[PDB]
UniProtKB/Swiss-Prot annotation, chain B:
Glutathione binds at residues 76, 109-112, 127-128. Belongs to the GST superfamily. Xi-class GSH transferase family. It comes from the Bacteria. The gene is pcpF. This is Glutathionyl-hydroquinone reductase PcpF. Transmembrane segments: none annotated. InterPro entries: Glutathione-S-Trfase_C-like, Glutathione-S-Trfase_C_sf, Glutathione_S-Trfase_N, GST_Omega-like_C, GST_Omega/GSH, Thioredoxin-like_sf. It comes from Sphingobium chlorophenolicum. Residues 151-275 form the GST C-terminal domain.
Amino acid sequence: GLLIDGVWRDAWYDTKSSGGRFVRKESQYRGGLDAGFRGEPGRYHLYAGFACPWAHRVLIMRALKGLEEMISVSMVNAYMGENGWTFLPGDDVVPDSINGADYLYQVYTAADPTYTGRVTIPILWDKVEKRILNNESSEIIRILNSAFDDVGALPGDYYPAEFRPEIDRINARVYETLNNGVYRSGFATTQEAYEEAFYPLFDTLDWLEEHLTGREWLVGDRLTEADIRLFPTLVRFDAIYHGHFKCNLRRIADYPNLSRLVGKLASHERVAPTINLRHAKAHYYGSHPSVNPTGIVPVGPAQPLPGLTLQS
Amino acid sequence: GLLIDGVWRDGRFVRKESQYRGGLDAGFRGEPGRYHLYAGFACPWAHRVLIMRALKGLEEMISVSMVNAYMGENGWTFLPGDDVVPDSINGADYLYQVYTAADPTYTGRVTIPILWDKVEKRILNNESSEIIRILNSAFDDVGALPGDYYPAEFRPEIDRINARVYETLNNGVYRSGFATTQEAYEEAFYPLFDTLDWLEEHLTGREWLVGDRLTEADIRLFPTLVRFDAIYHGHFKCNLRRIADYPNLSRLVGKLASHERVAPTINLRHAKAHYYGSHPSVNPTGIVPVGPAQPLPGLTLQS
């Protein structure tokens, strides 16, 4: 599925070709973010969902800063079919208020009628300028972390200047080999590609587990955006990735230090309500017929996580 | 595909059950070098007879041919393919050709294991549950290492555990895996896990399932367990929890898999390839995970 000229096309990219006509696949809305800077209660609207681990990132930052009443939300259906992400009735759906769209693609198009590109979440929508402010997770996270600080946000700097270099090092490997790793693996079409993705993925877990040995968080001893982008992948791992995406060299459950980080975070009031594994499980098994044609959702692993029990 | 008249095809009514229930009577016979065994490293059914052949020390009185891991549009095949040995009897390419050599008008499923009488140039028995009983005895006069895995004194217990284990485990992984509707899926393995539970409780205290004998109930059962965490858990969505999660089942798996004689019949690498490569309906990408690195924890059982 792409938006081709404001028209929704589940048919190639397309007939001609690369080209023919070239289609930009990156996040095309990189606003917010600039010099100075940042915003306003009641002004911005978050589009997101429970399946996407990229959207999860912004949900976790929206909670951690307590922007839940300053930044409203709409939440899409777990089934991604002919029309892609949709707001049709269903588990955990929260409708497109202001715009009343049936399909996520209609949000992009409401703003720019000929839009050509992918139609993704999360989207930070500027309600006043009636358009997308920015729709790249990594970026939004930062937008939400810096100044709403000004206007009632809970204190919290998850990108400490003192540490940006190290955070950066980690976000990069984690992004490339893990965040996007589980997808490169699950969607790979040749065995070689599957192995060439899957193995670096575990090399990265093997590394993260060491780093975490006498630590509580990835960087210094502070929850930071490093963990916040690692956690969405972990939380879905054993319960979705390990099976569906074949990431099964071992379980996150088999990495004591990581399993501990996941428990810590899945136990935080605030983060906990942003998790909905039933929904993710359903979106992943039920929306990828290339990989899982019956669409049947495994009776899952029963109890894919832990709690928090190794203090003193 | 079926052997229809045959005529290999991907109106007649084919019969599901295996059709050659030979052997089995009063007399045996069980001469050395007379019988040929057609199996493979992937198929659990086959694995039963591979084990019973290895336990009764009959691996030289009974020659094997070992099918190729990829079940294609032709079926089990002997093509030079990776993991094993060809048909020294009819130099056949496809397993179906074996069936056909004996009965050029055969109608049935083309399956393994097979007990072939090299002399009558026909199929004796092609039924796992039966083949193991033949091997367990009819050779004892002629050289079999002593063993009785269907000891008369227990046939009732053995027979009853077998029934449950068959219809909901042995056969349950498959039914849950090829189930095509969430509803059917759940109808199949919720009750399969029920049996793992039953089996776990039941195996508490015991070292084997029946008698303190390693018995055929254990051989019928090992093949499903040993493939379970590597293939079934993943590929057939049998994932409620691992066999690693059941301590006594694990105890039993280790105990058997480390048994010399038995260990040599286990090729999980081959198994994985076959399941993940041969069920496009279940796993169309054909990729074979990697996955899990140590399926069955090693071996350490004692006081």
